[PDB]
Amino acid sequence: ETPREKLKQHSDACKAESGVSEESLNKVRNREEVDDPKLKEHAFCILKRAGFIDASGEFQLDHIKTKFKENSEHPEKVDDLVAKCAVKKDTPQHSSADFFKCVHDNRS
Length: 108
Prior knowledge:
Elements lengths: L13 H4 L6 H5 L8 H14 L10 H9 L8 H8 L6 H11 L6
Helix pairs in contact: 3-6, 4-5
């Protein structure tokens, strides 16, 4: 009668292709360079569940800005970072990674 992580939960099929296994994501912490597919792929799986972008490819900064605002201790650059980092690309899963990347290595 123990709750198994498998079966339930989401991203069940996101682990198939997006099998980054938190490998490439780790390298993101370091300001060097990263270009992994599973990274951008997996991220898109979270963007949808997060309630940011819709399955029909549609950015929603009105919700992103709010989320990035609360719990941050530095509300002021998010607004610009959102619109600036929310570059509408040819695909949603693409721009998705940009949202979970641009607002991290904003030093250089």
